[PDB]
Structures are given as structure tokens and as C-alpha cells.
Ligand binder design. Structure first.
Ligand SMILES: *C(=O)[C@@H](N)CCCC[NH3+]
Ligand SMILES: [Mg+2]
Ligand SMILES: [Mg+2]
Ligand SMILES: [Mg+2]
Ligand SMILES: [Mg+2]
Ligand SMILES: [Mg+2]
Ligand SMILES: [Mg+2]
Ligand SMILES: [Mg+2]
Ligand SMILES: [Mg+2]
Ligand SMILES: [Mg+2]
Ligand SMILES: [Mg+2]
Ligand SMILES: [Mg+2]
Ligand SMILES: [Mg+2]
Ligand SMILES: [Mg+2]
Ligand SMILES: [Mg+2]
Ligand SMILES: [Mg+2]
Ligand SMILES: [Mg+2]
Ligand SMILES: [Mg+2]
Ligand SMILES: [Mg+2]
Ligand SMILES: [Mg+2]
Ligand SMILES: [Mg+2]
Ligand SMILES: [Mg+2]
Ligand SMILES: [Zn+2]
Lengths: 86, 60, 155, 123
RNA sequence: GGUACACGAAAAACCUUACCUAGACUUGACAUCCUUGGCAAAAUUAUGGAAACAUAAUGGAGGUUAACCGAGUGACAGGU
RNA sequence: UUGUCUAGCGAGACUGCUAAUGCAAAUUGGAGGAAGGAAGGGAUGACGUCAAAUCAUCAUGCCCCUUAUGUCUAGGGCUGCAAACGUGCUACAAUGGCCAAUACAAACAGUCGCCAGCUUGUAAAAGUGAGCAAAUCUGUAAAGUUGGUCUCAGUUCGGAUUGAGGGCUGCAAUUCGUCCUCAUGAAGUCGGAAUCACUAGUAAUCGCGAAUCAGCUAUGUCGCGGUGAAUACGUUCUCG
RNA sequence: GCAUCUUUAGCUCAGUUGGUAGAGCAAAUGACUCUUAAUCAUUGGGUCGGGGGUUCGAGCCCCUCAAGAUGCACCA
């Protein structure tokens, strides 16, 4: 879908923290509000706290989850059972 | 919450796609005529007074 | 509650066999508002009729349509329970019109192939008083004959 | 017929016969047809061995029809083994894209299982 | 109900938006009236930032305050 | 292809003439006439009813909040889903599917736009790039005609759903944009009780344009033209 | 007398045969309407009659009490 010339997309605020956080050995969960950032190869090995709307759900990225958007691996709404009307 | 939105619309946003068109007489956001900058229910009042030159009732 | 009788539009003499009635059946088989398509379909069936019956297509069409034309018409009239029917003599204009409508209706349901051959077979099958349109005419005639008693009371 | 485990109708033209294969549709069938130079409108029954080997070779060069089923299957497992919300939406037998689920989208939910609408005694 | 249900809405990704979760503000984002000066607001580049917003920069059209930029200031502004 | 066409003014149709019968309005027929008896359509909608709808277009009495029910921003939501109904689109097909050639519109719109031609690309589109502030330039008309093929099959019908690869807009397309290409090929073979619209360029149907709009499964809305029917015997029943 | 059963939110009753409780009304809260009724949602509310004992654990199994009701004798 997304054009070629444009490429991928990160907010570059997430990119800067990831570069800083990968150099630092004692990595901790990275609190990012950017559900819009696509997972870049360098992201591999870090863990993020994506804002589902209410809380920050923790996602551990792998060498496989690479390519999709960072908010795609977290939910936003919840539905598990209806209730008999009558 | 009307007055604050009107003022914000006049102010320039930080993104081009963030700019929308709101009626200039009232503050109605939807159903705004870009040809006149006037919403559908202010255009009726203005058209029925003769303020807009040439807008006459239609018989087709 | 109307007190006015509707006007009537011209029927037009046919453009080939000069038999008005051809234009009427063309309009009857009309679907999707295609005048062109309908003429082609119908005209092709007369050519198939030539290849098969070795006779004049207009004569065969009249012999089929004239034979299908009914005589009595049963009008529904409910009073308390069900409807007691009433046989009435249908006008000449409606006689041809009803005949054409039945011809088309049983033609678009035959087990045959392209509607050209479908419609061609129905008319040739109706020139010998043995078909699907004939049975419909037979049924209404017998129903009217059975309900001969209430013919005197109409409304 | 003779092309792999597929049995293309014998009384049907070759360009439609290729569509009958799972991995070959209609447009891609024409691509094989033009590339092999074999003229269409040639009933497969009235065809010779010389064409039956070339068509098989190009079909083998393309993606095997039997491997595509496992390819889609690995992909769904690939999508579900990641834990994606889209995978979850595909997981519970629901529209995977953005299709609405309020009053429509029954082609993925099978037959209707009618429940009991609320009781309105008036208010 | 007829006279609601491709209706308000002649365009909900952000904006719209009036809702929820959060991060920030208090004569306030906008206005007048009053004591009082104008030698700005913008925009943009930095750093921290989810962005609000802060700390630094070119200090800005102009016209001497016209409009606005403010201070002080309580009546109040504001409410989809 | 010389008098179309476009838009200013005017003429024209007035029961004006005649026949019938009525006191008189007036009804019917005929004449001539492009048009005959509200020539077709539109705007134009009495007092009032339903305490009908809108405090969320706007304005406003009264009540309520006033470091919060006011304000700014980021993310989510208005797009959910065991279900039911309403309005539409697409179909279940040879009055058709696909391919090739090809004829004939009206209206409207356009300088952050319409975009011709050319080059690349299986295509959406990209690059180059004139022309047009517009009766000048641009926005491919489709059904329709002819030819080839399918030969009645859940199919060369039907397109849903799903996977992958691309293009455009936009900071940004996962929640939640649409387009193209490839892959798959749900249901559905005329739809129960019961219901809706329509009296001629009307119903049915085929395209085209505009509004809001950066973009939008608007199949919606407002307009324009192409083809173009059937029926009305009558008020016994039915609704108002 | 005896043998048998019952005592469970404000009321009428299921609990299950051992991991510590709900159903229907009543009440309240909203929603809903000019406002009510009704309806609809939601909802707080328990010394499982009082003690003892078994069990890791008793509304649940066994005893004694307190209050009633049953079936068997107001000697065949
Ligand atoms: C009659 O019923 C007698 N057999 C019973 C006498 C009982 C005396 N305790
Ligand atoms: Mg307001
Ligand atoms: Mg959607
Ligand atoms: Mg109503
Ligand atoms: Mg929003
Ligand atoms: Mg100065
Ligand atoms: Mg001064
Ligand atoms: Mg108010
Ligand atoms: Mg009038
Ligand atoms: Mg009312
Ligand atoms: Mg938002
Ligand atoms: Mg909606
Ligand atoms: Mg429609
Ligand atoms: Mg054909
Ligand atoms: Mg010219
Ligand atoms: Mg089937
Ligand atoms: Mg199809
Ligand atoms: Mg998407
Ligand atoms: Mg069939
Ligand atoms: Mg009418
Ligand atoms: Mg249709
Ligand atoms: Mg109320
Ligand atoms: Zn307005």
C-alpha cells in the first residue's frame, strides 16, 4: 500500500530513544505513545509500552514482528460476551 | 464548547490537513458552502433578505 | 371515483409484415428498455419458423395468437368468504393483449435454449392447439363454464 | 487429464482448463498460454504430447498449486504466532480488514443463530 | 407510526468532536469596561519533550500608538 | 453541408369562430392552428391540529458549574457484535458473460484546478509537458450496430471472503482511506405470510456532471441527457 | 411420649450432598415520560436458628439445645 519512495515511517522521537536505549545495556521498557511507528530492524530486542487508550501494554519485539506498525500488536477495545436481552 | 473552536479555526494549525472551514457568520462546522463561506441555514436567511447579489429563487 | 376514461396511445402498424400486433408483442417481450434487442429476438424467430414450418410467418403467428385468444374473463368479487367469480365478455383490445402476455410468460419458462428458439417453439406449438398457453386458456374457460350461475350478478 | 493431480475437463478449452488448477487463475493461465505460444481455442482433447510437456514445465516454473495451500496456512500461522491484533481478528472468525460487524458480514459467520430481541412492553 | 431509520451529517484516520484515558492552564484560548505604558505578536531554528508547554536565539509588519502588544485590575468571559 | 445555435425584445391560444343545449355560467364536437379548452413541468402551501421537530445552526427567560460541566494537546472512540428491522447496490444469466472494431448526447465544472499529446509501466499511476480563467482548451459517454466465442453447467454465471505485491492523498492509512494487479471463488438457479412505486418521454433501464472534499466500497444526495414501454372495463370491495 | 422433618438477606423458597450461597418478590438507584403507573437495566442487602464435635475445610455429615410442624399411643 504505502508508497515506495516514501519508505517506512517512524516519528524519529521513537528512533532517537531506541538508538540511545540500544547502546545502554540495562534496557527497561520504553514508554512510547507512537502506535504509528513501523517496527525498524534496530528495534529488535527492545520492549515498548504502547498506549492502548487507557494503559501502556508491554510488547516484546522480536526478529519476526518486524515490518508492521507498533500499535498493531496491541488492542484498543474489548468484547468477550453478550447478554441475553429477554 | 463553541467559542473556543471558532477562535481555533481562525488560528493557523501546525498541519495543513488540520485546517477545516467553519461558517463565518455563525460557528456551524458541517454543511458549509465554500462558494460563499456561509452554512446552509445562514445562507437561507441571507438569501431571503437580498444580501447576496443574484441569488434568486429557482423555477428551473 | 374517477369518472374519466383514459385515452389510448397509437398501436402503430408493424414495419415489416405490416401487422400492428407485431409491435405489441415486441413491447411485451421488452425487458431493460431495449427496443433494438427485442426486435432482433422476435424477428429471428420468424426466420426459424420459415426454416421449420415452410409457411408464411405472419400467417402462422396469427393462427397461433388467434387460437390462444380467450373469450370469457373471470373477475373476482368477494362478499363474505372467499370469492364467487363472475364471467364477463372481455373487449377485443384486451383479448389480443391478454393473449400476447400469456404467450410471452410461458415462453420465458420453457426448457429450450436461447429465447429465440424458446419463443419460436411456443408460437409454433400454439398453432396446433397443443401447448402451455392453450392450457391456460382452457383452464379459465372451464372455470367460467363451471361458474356460469353467478354470471348474472356482477355488481 | 495428465497435468499433475488436476483433472482438467476434457471437452473444455485449454485456457479455461488451466483456471481449473488451484494455483492458476485466468489471467495467469493466459500468461502461460502466450509464453508457451500454444494457440488458444484448441480443445485439450485435440492436443498432442508436445504441448503437454511445455505447459507442465512452465507450470512447474510458476508456484506449485499444491504448495499455495500450505503457503496460506503458514501465513495464517505466521500471523497468529506473532500475536497481532489483526491475527486475533482473523482468529475469532471475523472480518480481517475494516469491514463492519454490526448488521452485516455473515459470509465469515456462517448461518444465522437467531436469539431473542428485547421485550418492549412500552414506556 | 403515517410525519424517525442513505435523518441532522453537502464527506468521523489527525482535524472535525460535542465522548473516554491521560499530560498541562486559571479574569483564562476569545471580549468589553475601567489607571497605565508600549522600543510586538507571528513564524522559524535549538534542548527537554507523546505533543501540550518550557527554557535560548533572527527580535522583527508597522506607527509612536492607529489596529494590536501588553502590565494592574475587579466587574466577569466561557458551557454542544 | 449557411442558417442551426446561443439570449434580449416581441407575436402567438383568447372557448377567439362555428354546431348542439342551457336563463347564465358552462359542457361536448368540428374548423384552422406548433400548441384547445388549467398545452406539460416548477416556485407559490389559508385559519389551524398533533403542548408534532429543533436550547446541538443562531438568539433567548430561568436553573446549574466558576483553579471546572471552562481551556490546550497526544492516544483511543464515534467503525464494536450472539442478534432484529428500514432504505439501496450487486446478483442468481444466453433479452447474457468475455474479446475486437465502432456511431450518436445534454447539462455542469475547472488555475493549489481541468489536464490534451508524448515516454515508462500487466495496471492503478509517474515523468515530461503544451492549451485553457474558458460557446476557443480539458473532463475517453454507456446502453446501441456488426463480427468471433461460450452452449445452460453452480458454469467463461455470481462476486463475497481471504493471502501477497504495487499506486495516490496526506505528518500519519494498525485501530479506520480508497484504486490497480495477481491468487481464492461464500451464498445465490427468481425468493414464504405480506407488501411498495408509477398514468409518457412516465415506469424500467444506460451512462454523464456538480455540491461538501487533501483522500474516501456515496452503491448516498442534487441535477443532465440516450433507449423507452404496459394498462385504466369500473367504484362492488380497500385506505385517506 | 415416640420417631421424623424444618429453621437460609425485609418476605416466600432453591441450595448439594464438604471447598464456605443464590432464585422470585419487597426496597433503592438510575434509565424512561409533561409527570407518574408499568416497563427496563443495574444494585446494595446474609450471624446459613444457637453451641459442640469430625475434617486441612462444614449452609452441606454427626450430637445437645431453642421454636414449630409431621407421622406413630389421649391403653383394643
Ligand atoms: C392394644 O393396642 C394393646 N395391645 C396395647 C397395650 C399397650 C400397653 N402399654
Ligand atoms: Mg452554541
Ligand atoms: Mg470501514
Ligand atoms: Mg412523527
Ligand atoms: Mg477526534
Ligand atoms: Mg519597535
Ligand atoms: Mg506612547
Ligand atoms: Mg446555556
Ligand atoms: Mg397560485
Ligand atoms: Mg413534546
Ligand atoms: Mg483523536
Ligand atoms: Mg455511522
Ligand atoms: Mg438510490
Ligand atoms: Mg454475445
Ligand atoms: Mg475549435
Ligand atoms: Mg449453490
Ligand atoms: Mg462473476
Ligand atoms: Mg489499511
Ligand atoms: Mg437456471
Ligand atoms: Mg396520475
Ligand atoms: Mg436496476
Ligand atoms: Mg425530558
Ligand atoms: Zn452559518
Amino acid at each position: 500500500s504505502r508508497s515506495a519512495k516514501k519508505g517506512a515511517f517512524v516519528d524519529a522521537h521513537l528512533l532517537k530513544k531506541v538508538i540511545d536505549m540500544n547502546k545502554q545495556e540495562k534496557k527497561r521498557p520504553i514508554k512510547t505513545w507512537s502506535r504509528r511507528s513501523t517496527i525498524f530492524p534496530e528495534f529488535v530486542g527492545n520492549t515498548f509500552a504502547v498506549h492502548n487508550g487507557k494503559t501502556f501494554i508491554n510488547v516484546y519485539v522480536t526478529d519476526d514482528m518486524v515490518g508492521h506498525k507498533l500499535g498493531e500488536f496491541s488492542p484498543t477495545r474489548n468484547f468477550k460476551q453478550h447478554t441475553a436481552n429477554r | 464548547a463553541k467559542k473556543s473552536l471558532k477562535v481555533k479555526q481562525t488560528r493557523i494549525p501546525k498541519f495543513a490537513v488540520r485546517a477545516y472551514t467553519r461558517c463565518q457568520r455563525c460557528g456551524r462546522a458541517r454543511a458549509v458552502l465554500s462558494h460563499f463561506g456561509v452554512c446552509r441555514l445562514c445562507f437561507r436567511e441571507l438569501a431571503y433578505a437580498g444580501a447576496i447579489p443574484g441569488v434568486k429563487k429557482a423555477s428551473w | 371515483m374517477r369518472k374519466n376514461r383514459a385515452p389510448k396511445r397509437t398501436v402503430l402498424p408493424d414495419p415489416v409484415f405490416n401487422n400492428t400486433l407485431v409491435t405489441r408483442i415486441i413491447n411485451v417481450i421488452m425487458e431493460d428498455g431495449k427496443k433494438g434487442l427485442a426486435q432482433r429476438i422476435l424477428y429471428g424467430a420468424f426466420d426459424l419458423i420459415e426454416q421449420r414450418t415452410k409457411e408464411k410467418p405472419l400467417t402462422v403467428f396469427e393462427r397461433a395468437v388467434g387460437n390462444v385468444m380467450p373469450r370469457l374473463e373471470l373477475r373476482v368479487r368477494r362478499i363474505a368468504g372467499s370469492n364467487y367469480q363472475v364471467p364477463t365478455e372481455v373487449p377485443q383490445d384486451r383479448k389480443i393483449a391478454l393473449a400476447l402476455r400469456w404467450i410471452a410468460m410461458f415462453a420465458r419458462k420453457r426448457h429450450e435454449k436461447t429465447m429465440l428458439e424458446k419463443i419460436a417453439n411456443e408460437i409454433i406449438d400454439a398453432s396446433n392447439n397443443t401447448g402451455a398457453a392453450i392450457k391456460k386458456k382452457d383452464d379459465t374457460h372451464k372455470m367460467a363454464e363451471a361458474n356460469k350461475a353467478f354470471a348474472h350478478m356482477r355488481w | 487429464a495428465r497435468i499433475l493431480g488436476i483433472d482438467i475437463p476434457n471437452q473444455k478449452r485449454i485456457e479455461i482448463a488451466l483456471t481449473y488448477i488451484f494455483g492458476i487463475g485466468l489471467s495467469r493461465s493466459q500468461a502461460i498460454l502466450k509464453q508457451a505460444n500454444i494457440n488458444p481455442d484448441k480443445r485439450v482433447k485435440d492436443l498432442t504430447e508436445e504441448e503437454f510437456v511445455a505447459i507442465r514445465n512452465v507450470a512447474s516454473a510458476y508456484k506449485i498449486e499444491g504448495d499455495l495451500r500450505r503457503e496460506i496456512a503458514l501465513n495464517i500461522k505466521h500471523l497468529s504466532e506473532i500475536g497481532a491484533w489483526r491475527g486475533l481478528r482473523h482468529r475469532k472468525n471475523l472480518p480481517v480488514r475494516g469491514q463492519r460487524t454490526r448488521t452485516n458480514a455473515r459470509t465469515r459467520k456462517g448461518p444465522r443463530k437467531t436469539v431473542a430481541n428485547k421485550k418492549i412492553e412500552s414506556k
